[PDB]
Write a protein that binds this ligand. Structure first.
Ligand SMILES: CCCCCCCCCCCCCCCCCC(=O)OC[C@H](COP(=O)([O-])OCC(O)COP(=O)([O-])OC[C@@H](COC(=O)CCCCCCCCCCCCCCCCC)OC(=O)CCCCCCCCCCCCCCCCC)OC(=O)CCCCCCCCCCCCCCCCC
Ligand SMILES: CCCCCCCCCCC[C@H](O)CC(=O)SCCNC(=O)CCNC(=O)[C@H](O)C(C)(C)COP(=O)(O)O
Ligand code: SF4
Ligand code: SF4
Ligand code: SF4
Ligand code: SF4
Ligand code: FES
Ligand SMILES: [K+]
Ligand SMILES: [Zn+2]
Lengths: 209, 96, 176, 115, 60, 95, 238, 129, 263, 115
């Protein structure tokens, strides 16, 4: 490779992890809709929002996988989708020093089975998602506000939520307490329309609809 | 070169000066008005008009790399005099 | 390659247990603590006298901002608006205008000093080295309005801090 | 084998003085729970492939160290723990029942990036 | 007997404003993320972005 | 440095360590604050020939994720071979 | 200072010498820390067996950094998955038994020494080359290039108006942060902005286990637990 | 196949109670739905391919100080990005926002002929290149 | 029926007889890089950025003036076409004055956007540059003729749509000045659109000159009212005031052009 | 499509029943918060305050969305009893500082051009 600017590819890991790709597919055809390996040598296991506990428990205790040590769970809030929220788990294999990603789809009114049973690390990641995204997780001991303020109303990382939010706080003398009023900014957050009108990288071109 | 407004303040190079009836003048009272004494408008004129005998001249802006991106301004419009769009220095061919 | 941090076992011979019993009954490791700080007491302090002398800095220091001007006195800014676009906290607000002479420079240049983050993206964004951060850091105030800068104040600082800006950029234009 | 390990190096799980037959009893049970799994399921097609052999090296070698260097599961004090949850995992998918095909293709083009 | 921590007393919409700033403007947030260590956070953000960009840094 | 011999042997004895070998503050061991002018190097693409950016574009070399299985006797394969156990560091095993 | 594609500015001349000066004297200071702290009975007694988590509970809780190493787990991102240049360097990972906070205190201290050898090799083996990638579409060109060659001006102009456009993807890249495993899950829309970038704060997982590592101990020890839990409000509160 | 009390509910999805919008920004905020027309400056097209959720403008008043255009409406810089228009409206009424849709202005066919520029009795004979 | 079949880097596409490559690959969602072709303006084929090489064809073909026939699987991303786009661009780039911070097209410039996608990363030009005398053809458009790319888009728009011949390209060689020779002024009632037609900062709006930059304008849609046509317009506002009136796309009523009065 | 997954409650009868229990719980909790928070309001105005925000969302049909709504009310009641919220948080609900806004079309017209 005479070119030193490109990221050097790693073919052996690509095929080997891809070989693990259909492995997790064949033994669990009930759950996995799609298995993906990227150019960055990582697998994404697309699962239905029904068997989160089993498929995670499968990766957690399998002798040839032992995929455990949950990294983080987070959504994307893809708005132009019939299931906006996309809960995404990340697991870090210790024995095989590899990483996995299992992603579901979920509407705002379709609970997610609480993965705290599989990874009782996930006791805190989802509480953030409960308030910061709004998707509620079913059969869970406690899902409170852990990131936003007390009594806050809304779901901030929802794509419909503004940067400044809906309320602004100050100290008001007659009430002798901090009070919240409708947000009015000293400076408007100047948006920037900046995407190039010309065609980007042709590799990922969307096919003609 | 800056004149004093009728209210008592000065006028910025942009041409800013508050009218007397405006209530915002209170921000300046009990204080002073910060205005740069030097004005770039009259600080470009005392530069002597350069007389260079060439068709096209690149004006680096002094200091080479410690200047502005070079512009190959053109010296053929005899009625006008060429000027660098970054520096403003007035380049003209003597009598062409 | 891994190294254990606590796997040592205490030998049960009479010498080692005598060391342990002597260690706790008549405290020694604690007295060793006394001896260490006592040596620290009989040592020079590293405390400078402010503002009689201050800690060293570097020519790349980013501090209070200041617009500059050409040796002719002509301003460097061309209202290309690069600094506003990159300004990560949107502390740059500028408005251009076709100046009467024809050089057409900016009309407004307000740095929201209490919104800026001193990241230094503004100076590297400018293609004519117009906006730079002076090495000053003692420019505190008692009023919020003082912190909100403007074109006039920025130009004044460039007229004030000019020896440092010229010298620091002279020691750095080869680096960046 | 040799002298018993004073500590496995990890707090929590502790050294067990009977590692061979204990690893044996887990690895016959997972065969037992592999008895009542239908053959068409891919779970059986891999479990019998792997569990029969890592049953074999247990009986093949009677020393703790020599079978450890081929197990590649660290010390055996954690592979019996690892076999335990594998024995747990075998029972879990018994009532998960994943051998059937998946429920449904995703709503329209739910996947795919960019939007 | 109870050890539930009340957190968020520092919370800022870091991810939310990351969504609206460009990658170059997104960089200073990570320097501000951990207020104990600054620079090692830039390593994480930079390593991710170059991986997506399929660009590797020079050995220097 | 400043500090006389009498204070020195007190601080060496009380600490038990030779502190005068290296100090926690610098008297004269630093680089001179101003530096001679530098000359920065060049890189792999500061050439005028066969450096067409088309055959260097790491952004354009990235293909979309490769399909594996879509919903629309075989061996058993591990995501990666088990990690080999590390050795007791030959520098100093214990502590 | 660290940007996609390298470091924006160069190393000032004579900087590495001062690194050598401080690093040479740094070890001497760290022994002074150990001399006061390692054998001090009051500190030790207030930090032995006070707060303890087992291997499987810690690793299941998403712990990382010192705690997995303190509990005895043989894992470290620099060794297992060497990123950047960490493959070509020699050091050791200070893991320990027991798993209490004293060993975690010992784990950090030996990390200091095992760090110091890395800088010792780094400034001994600093290679000559450009500070940033030679790709102008991701790395702004040099200032001299900007004011001389136009494509430098255009690329810098576009790099400083919208910047590079990251192709779509979704990677969670984590590194051995000094306090733990810091990761970012960044999804790219395909434009010059990140669609969503989720930060794996090491303390966020660490503080999540505060209940487990503060069970049964007296009230006075909780501040010690967060002391060894190593929670900085900057990232746990996001 | 997915037996988790799969029971039919046909009322239109209305999450307006839980999104967080206040009682006046849910109704008064009329929202437009168009495709951004190509910027006539640029011949590039790669911005007309998606839909958005642009809102109408509110008061932009000059602040007493240096000239910030202080605003009091939070729903200003919240344009969305949508693949089609049916999901666009599907987003509209779930949070209960009145829509105002607009069909995509697909370019008309561009039948051109270089030989047409050079003709015999046709006006399309071009004398400028 | 009579329609003939071709491919575009794989996928089969159905095309009209006489179809050019530009109007052949746009059916799948491709914009071939162009600098001298406009959809409703007559073909030029002069910028040579439309160039694309196909397999089994030794020489690259001018896409905007190439009548496609059966079995023409246009290799859009072929390396030779990629080489052709790079060299042709850097040839435009060579004699371009470094005015990007002082050109209003900055942020909405076709030359800048294309040079960021189909562009190199550094210059091989080590010689002196070329400069052109600026003209003045009305206190409504600014003419920085040094930034011109000689795409001749101005002269065609005037002669075919505006119905006037106050624009032309004088000279022989590299110089090729485009202007009026004798000083004149653009009297067309549709003269304002030539600002939108110019891909570079050669032609720019005098009233708007250095008042705003493209990436801060919150575009909004409205109509003309000066004329009863109700021409669709794009109103570019910033921080609470209107900067420029830009023409929208509506084809059968106003296409992409608006009257000088409403501009 | 049409088939949906109930959050916790399928039928509206028992969905409104949980609302009733939340309705029961808060009316038992209105006075104690006022007592413990050293508040400056009476028990009455809180009760119809509680009533009226049962009413701003009383015109919704979907069983799922109200079932997320009832747990959200639960998501506020436990914060009040556990004195997690401060005085400034529950008097924010008792909107006091903000100026009353124009209601009639003419008053809106007189103040400003905001529809
Ligand atoms: C108690 C111990 C006995 C008295 C102090 C002895 C002492 O200071 O010895 C010098 C010296 C001070 O410590 P050092 O770190 O060696 O100082 C290095 C330089 O002198 C560092 O330079 P410097 O700081 O000595 O040079 C300037 C200094 C000059 O300082 C001196 O010359 C020191 C003597 C005091 C003046 O003067 C000042 O800084 C001005 C401010 C003086 C502060 C007030 C001093 C009050 C003295 C006591 C008054 C009565 C109570 O100590 C010794 O030489 C040996 C230790 C003390 C032995 C004492 C006899 C047994
Ligand atoms: C500081 C003071 C305290 C703190 C501050 C005050 C706190 C107040 C408590 C929080 C109240 C919360 O917002 C709303 C809620 O719990 S529920 C909403 C209505 N519930 C529904 O289900 C909707 C559909 N409506 C129906 O189903 C029926 O029409 C209806 C129930 C209206 C009549 O009854 P039915 O039986 O017919
Ligand atoms: S240093 Fe301050 S003014 Fe400059 S770009 Fe950064 S935030 Fe803006
Ligand atoms: S300070 Fe520099 S970057 Fe900012 S507008 Fe002026 S010239 Fe442009
Ligand atoms: S026309 Fe484009 S390339 Fe030329 S100076 Fe203007 S912005 Fe730069
Ligand atoms: S002036 Fe503009 S439209 Fe005319 S030829 Fe030059 S670039 Fe083309
Ligand atoms: S468009 Fe084909 S050459 Fe200009
Ligand atoms: K133009
Ligand atoms: Zn100049």
């Amino acid at each position: 490779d005479t070119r030193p600017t490109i990221r050097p590819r790693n073919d052996v890991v690509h095929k080997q992890l891809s070989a693990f790709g259909q492995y997790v597919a064949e033994i669990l055809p009930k759950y996995v809709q799609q298995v993906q390996v990227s150019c960055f040598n990582e697998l994404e296991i697309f699962i239905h929002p029904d068997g989160v506990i089993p498929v995670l428990t499968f990766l957690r205790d399998h002798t040839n996988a032992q995929f455990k040590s949950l990294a983080d769970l987070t959504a994307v809030d893809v708005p132009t989708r019939q299931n906006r929220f996309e809960i995404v788990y990340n697991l870090l294999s210790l024995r095989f020093n590899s990483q996995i990603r299992v992603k579901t789809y979920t509407d705002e009114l379709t609970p997610i089975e609480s993965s705290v049973t599989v990874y009782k690390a996930a006791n805190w990641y989802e509480r953030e998602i409960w308030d910061m995204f709004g998707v509620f997780f079913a059969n869970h001991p406690d899902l409170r506000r852990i990131l936003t303020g007390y009594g806050f109303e809304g779901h901030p990382f929802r794509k419909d939520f503004p940067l400044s939010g809906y309320v602004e706080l100050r100290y008001d003398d007659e009430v002798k307490r901090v009070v919240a009023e409708p947000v009015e900014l000293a400076q408007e957050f100047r948006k920037f329309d900046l995407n190039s009108p010309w065609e980007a990288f042709p590799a990922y071109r969307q096919p003609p609809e | 070169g800056v004149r004093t407004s009728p209210t008592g303040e000065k006028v910025t190079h942009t041409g800013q000066a508050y009218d007397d009836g405006d209530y915002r003048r209170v921000r300046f009272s009990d204080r002073q008005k910060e205005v740069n004494e030097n004005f770039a408008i009259d600080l470009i004129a005392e530069q002597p008009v350069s007389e260079v005998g060439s068709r096209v001249i690149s004006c680096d802006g002094g200091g080479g790399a410690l200047g502005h991106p070079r512009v190959y301004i053109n010296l053929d419009k005899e009625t006008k005099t060429g000027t660098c769009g970054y520096c403003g220095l007035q380049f003209r061919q003597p009598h062409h | 390659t891994y190294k254990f941090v606590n796997m040592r076992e205490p030998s049960m011979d009479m010498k080692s247990v005598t060391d342990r019993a002597a260690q706790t009954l008549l405290w020694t490791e604690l007295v060793r603590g006394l001896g260490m700080t006592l040596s620290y007491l009989f040592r020079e302090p590293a405390t400078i006298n402010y503002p009689f002398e201050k800690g060293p800095l570097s020519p790349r220091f980013r501090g209070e901002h200041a617009l500059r001007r050409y040796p002719s006195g002509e301003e460097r800014c061309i209202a290309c608006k690069l600094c506003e676009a990159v300004c990560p906290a949107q502390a740059i607000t500028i408005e251009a205008e076709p100046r009467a002479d024809g050089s057409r420079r900016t009309t407004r240049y307000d740095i929201d000093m209490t919104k800026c983050i001193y990241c230094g993206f503004c100076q590297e964004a400018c293609p004519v080295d117009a906006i730079v951060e002076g090495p000053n850091f003692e420019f505190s105030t008692e009023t919020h309005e003082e912190l909100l800068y403007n074109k006039e104040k920025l130009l004044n600082n460039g007229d004030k801090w000019e020896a440092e800006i010229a010298a620091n950029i002279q020691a750095d234009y080869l680096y960046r | 084998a040799g002298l018993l390990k004073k500590t496995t190096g990890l707090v929590g799980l502790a050294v067990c003085e009977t590692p061979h037959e204990r690893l044996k009893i887990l690895y016959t049970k997972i065969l037992d729970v592999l008895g009542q799994i239908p053959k068409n399921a891919a779970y059986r097609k891999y479990t019998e492939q792997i569990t029969n052999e890592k049953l074999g090296m247990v009986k093949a070698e009677p020393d703790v160290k020599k079978l450890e260097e081929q197990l590649q599961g660290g010390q055996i004090e954690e592979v019996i723990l690892q076999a335990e949850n594998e024995l747990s995992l075998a029972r879990k998918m018994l009532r998960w029942k994943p051998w059937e095909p998946l429920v449904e293709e995703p709503p329209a083009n739910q996947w795919k990036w960019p939007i | 007997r109870k050890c539930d921590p009340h957190i968020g007393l520092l919370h800022r919409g870091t991810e939310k404003l990351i969504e609206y700033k460009t990658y170059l403007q997104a960089l200073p947030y990570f320097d501000r993320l951990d207020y104990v260590s600054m620079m090692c956070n830039e390593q994480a953000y930079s390593l991710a972005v170059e991986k997506l960009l399929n660009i590797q840094p020079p050995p220097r | 440095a400043s500090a006389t011999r009498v204070i020195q042997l007190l601080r060496n004895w009380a600490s038990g360590r030779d502190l005068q070998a290296k100090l926690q503050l610098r008297y004269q061991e630093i680089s001179k604050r101003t530096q001679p002018p530098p000359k920065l190097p060049v890189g792999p693409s500061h050439k005028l020939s066969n450096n067409y950016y088309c055959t260097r574009d790491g952004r354009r070399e990235a293909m979309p994720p490769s399909i594996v299985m879509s919903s629309q006797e075989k061996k058993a394969v591990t995501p990666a071979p088990p990690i080999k156990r590390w050795e007791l560091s030959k520098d100093q095993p214990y502590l | 200072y660290i940007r996609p594609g390298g470091v924006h500015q160069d190393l000032p001349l004579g900087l590495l010498d001062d690194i050598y000066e401080f690093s040479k004297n740094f070890s001497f200071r760290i022994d002074e820390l150990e001399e006061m702290l390692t054998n001090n009975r009051i500190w030790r007694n207030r930090t032995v067996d006070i707060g303890v988590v087992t291997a499987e509970d810690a690793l299941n809780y998403g712990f990382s950094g010192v705690m997995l190493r303190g509990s005895g787990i043989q894992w470290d991102l620099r060794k297992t998955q060497p990123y950047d240049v960490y493959d070509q360097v020699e050091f050791d990972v200070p893991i320990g038994s027991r798993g209490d906070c004293y060993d975690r205190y010992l784990c950090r201290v030996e990390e200091m020494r095992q760090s110091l050898r890395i800088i010792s090799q780094c400034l001994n083996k600093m290679p000559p080359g450009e500070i940033k990638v030679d790709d102008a579409k991701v790395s702004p060109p040099k200032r001299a290039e900007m004011k001389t060659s136009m494509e430098s001006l255009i690329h810098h102009f576009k790099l400083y108006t919208e910047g590079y456009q990251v192709p779509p993807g979704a990677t969670y890249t984590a590194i051995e942060a000094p306090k733990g495993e810091f990761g970012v899950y960044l999804v790219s829309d395909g434009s010059s902005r990140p669609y969503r970038c989720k930060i794996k704060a090491p303390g966020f997982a660490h503080l999540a286990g505060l209940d487990k590592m503060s069970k049964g101990h007296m009230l006075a020890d909780v501040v010690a637990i967060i002391g060894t839990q190593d929670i900085v409000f900057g990232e746990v509160d996001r | 196949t997915q037996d988790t009390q799969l029971i039919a509910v046909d009322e239109k999805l209305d999450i307006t109670t839980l999104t967080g919008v206040p009682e006046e920004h849910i109704k008064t905020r009329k929202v437009r739905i168009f495709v951004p027309a190509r910027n006539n400056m640029q011949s590039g097209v790669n911005n007309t391919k998606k839909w958005k959720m642009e809102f109408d403008t509110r008061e932009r008043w000059e602040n007493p100080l240096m000239g910030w255009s202080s605003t009091a409406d939070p729903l200003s810089n919240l344009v969305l990005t949508f693949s089609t228009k049916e999901d666009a409206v599907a987003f509209a009424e779930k949070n209960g926002w009145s829509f105002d849709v607009e069909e995509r202005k697909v370019p008309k066919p561009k039948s051109k002929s270089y030989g047409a520029n050079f003709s015999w009795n046709k006006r399309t004979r071009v004398s400028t290149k | 029926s009579n329609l003939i079949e071709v491919f575009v880097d794989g996928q089969s596409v159905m095309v009209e007889p006489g179809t050019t490559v530009l109007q052949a690959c746009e059916k799948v969602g491709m914009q071939i890089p162009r600098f001298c072709y406009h959809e409703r303006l007559s073909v030029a084929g002069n910028c040579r950025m439309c160039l694309v090489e196909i397999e089994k064809a030794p020489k690259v073909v001018a896409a905007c003036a190439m009548p496609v026939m059966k079995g023409w699987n246009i290799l859009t991303n072929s390396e030779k076409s990629k080489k052709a786009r790079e060299g042709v661009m850097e040839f435009l780039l060579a004699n371009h004055p470094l005015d990007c911070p002082i050109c209003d097209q900055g942020g909405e410039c076709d030359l800048q956007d294309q040079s960021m996608m189909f562009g190199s990363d550094r210059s091989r030009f080590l010689e002196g540059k070329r400069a052109v005398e600026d003209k003045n053809i009305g206190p409504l458009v600014k003419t920085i003729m040094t930034r011109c790319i000689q795409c001749t888009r101005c002269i065609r728009f005037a002669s075919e749509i505006a119905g006037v011949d106050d624009l032309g390209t004088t000279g022989r060689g590299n110089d090729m000045q485009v202007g009026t020779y004798i000083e004149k002024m653009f009297m067309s009632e549709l003269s304002g659109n030539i600002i939108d037609i110019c891909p570079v900062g050669a032609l720019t709006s005098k009233p708007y000159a250095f008042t705003a930059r493209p990436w801060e304008t919150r575009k909004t849609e409205s109509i003309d009212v000066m004329d009863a046509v109700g021409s669709n317009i794009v109103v570019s506002t910033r921080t609470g005031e209107v900067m420029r009136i830009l023409p929208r796309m509506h084809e059968d009523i106003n296409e992409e052009w608006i009257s000088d009065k409403t501009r | 499509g049409t088939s949906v997954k109930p959050i916790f409650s399928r039928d509206m009868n028992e969905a409104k029943r949980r609302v009733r229990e939340l309705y029961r719980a808060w009316y038992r909790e209105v006075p104690n918060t006022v007592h413990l928070f050293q508040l400056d309001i009476s028990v009455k105005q809180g009760r119809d305050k509680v009533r009226e925000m049962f009413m701003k969302n009383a015109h919704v049909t979907d069983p799922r969305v109200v079932d997320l709504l009832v747990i959200k009310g639960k998501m506020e009641l436990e914060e009040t009893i556990n004195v997690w919220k401060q005085r400034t948080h529950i008097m924010r609900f008792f909107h006091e500082t903000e100026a009353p806004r124009p209601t009639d079309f003419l008053s809106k017209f007189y103040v400003g051009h905001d529809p």
